[PDB]
C-alpha cells in the first residue's frame, strides 16, 4: 500500500526543513493573498 512518506510530505529537506525560501515561491503565496 502507501508506504512511508505521508507524515512528512511536502516539506523539502533543503528548503522548509532549513527555514530557507526558494527563489520564486513568494510569487505563489502572494498570488493567493493579493488577488
Amino acid at each position: 500500500t502507501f508506504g512511508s512518506g505521508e507524515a512528512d510530505c511536502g516539506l523539502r529537506p533543503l528548503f522548509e526543513k532549513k527555514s530557507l525560501e526558494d527563489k520564486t515561491e513568494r510569487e505563489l503565496l502572494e498570488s493567493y493573498i493579493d488577488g
Binding site: 500500500t1 510530505c9 523539502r12 529537506p13 527563489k23 493567493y32
Partner: protein, 254 residues
C-alpha cells in the same frame, strides 16, 4: 518548460523522470507521492492513436535528478516498476478525461535531500487554492520553445509558475469538451508574461504551497495543450483532488 528558469537544487524533490529503456530517452515527467508510488498522466503510458502502450519492463523511473542527461551518481535513484495502473475511465478517444496513472515501484526508495514525496490535497486545500489567478508551479525537462522544428532542450530541470485560469475562459479556448476533472493554467495574452509546460513535461506535477501548513501539494498533472507558450491557448491539467479517491483505492488495494 517554456519561459521558465533553472530549478534550484532540491527545489522539486518529488520530481520523477519516466525514462524509456530502449531506445534511451526521456518519455515524460511524474511525481513521487510515497516511498513506493509514482503518479503520472495516463497518456504517457497508454495512447492507442499512436499505438503507445508501455509495460512495466519498458521503463524505468529516475528520482532525485537535476541534470537532464548526466547520470547523477550518488544523487539520483533509478527504480524499476512492479505494476502500472491506468484509470479505467481514462478517455483517450475524446478529451483525455481522467488522464491519470499510478506506478508501483518494485521496492521502496529511501528519501534524501533530493528525493522526498509531495502531498496529495485534502478538501480544504482544494477549496482554498484552486482559484482563478492563483499560481501553481510546473517543473520538467521538456522543450524550451514553443516555436519550431529543435524545440530546445534544457541542461537542467526547469521551473515555471503559472496562474489558474477561470473555467469559462478555459472552455472558450478549445473545441475539446473540458470536464470537471481538468483545469487549465497559463497567462492570458494581455498579461504580458509567458510560460508553459511543453512536450516532455507531460505527466509532471503542478504544485501549490499551502499558506496553512507550508507544505507543497500536487494539485494537477500536466495533461495536454494546444501549442505550449501559445498565448490565447492554455495548458490543461488533471484535477488531482477530484481523482483522489481512485488514487487511494489503488494504493490501499496493492
Amino acid at each position: 518548460i517554456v519561459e521558465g528558469s533553472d530549478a534550484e537544487i532540491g527545489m522539486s524533490p518529488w520530481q520523477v523522470m519516466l525514462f524509456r529503456k530502449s531506445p534511451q530517452e526521456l518519455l515524460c515527467g511524474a511525481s513521487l507521492i510515497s516511498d513506493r508510488w509514482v503518479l503520472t498522466a495516463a497518456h504517457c503510458l497508454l495512447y492507442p492513436p499512436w499505438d503507445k502502450n508501455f509495460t512495466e519492463n519498458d521503463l524505468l523511473v529516475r528520482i532525485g535528478k537535476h541534470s537532464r542527461t548526466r547520470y547523477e551518481r550518488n544523487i539520483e535513484k533509478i527504480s524499476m516498476l512492479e505494476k502500472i495502473y491506468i484509470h479505467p475511465r481514462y478517455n483517450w478517444r475524446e478529451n483525455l478525461d481522467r488522464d491519470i496513472a499510478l506506478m508501483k515501484l518494485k521496492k521502496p526508495v529511501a528519501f534524501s535531500d533530493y528525493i522526498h514525496p509531495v502531498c496529495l490535497p485534502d478538501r480544504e486545500t482544494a477549496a482554498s487554492l484552486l482559484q482563478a489567478g492563483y499560481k501553481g508551479r510546473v517543473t520538467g525537462w521538456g522543450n524550451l520553445k514553443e516555436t519550431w522544428t529543435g524545440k530546445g532542450q534544457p541542461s537542467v530541470l526547469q521551473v515555471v509558475n503559472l496562474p489558474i485560469v477561470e473555467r469559462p475562459v478555459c472552455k472558450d479556448s478549445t473545441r475539446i469538451r473540458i470536464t470537471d476533472n481538468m483545469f487549465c493554467a497559463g497567462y492570458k495574452p494581455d498579461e504580458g508574461k509567458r510560460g508553459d509546460a511543453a512536450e516532455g513535461d507531460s505527466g509532471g506535477p503542478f504544485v501549490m504551497k499551502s499558506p496553512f501548513n507550508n507544505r507543497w501539494y500536487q494539485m494537477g498533472i500536466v495533461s495536454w495543450g494546444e501549442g505550449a507558450d501559445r498565448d490565447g491557448k492554455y495548458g490543461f491539467y488533471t484535477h488531482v483532488f477530484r481523482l483522489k479517491k481512485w488514487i487511494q483505492k489503488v494504493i490501499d488495494q496493492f
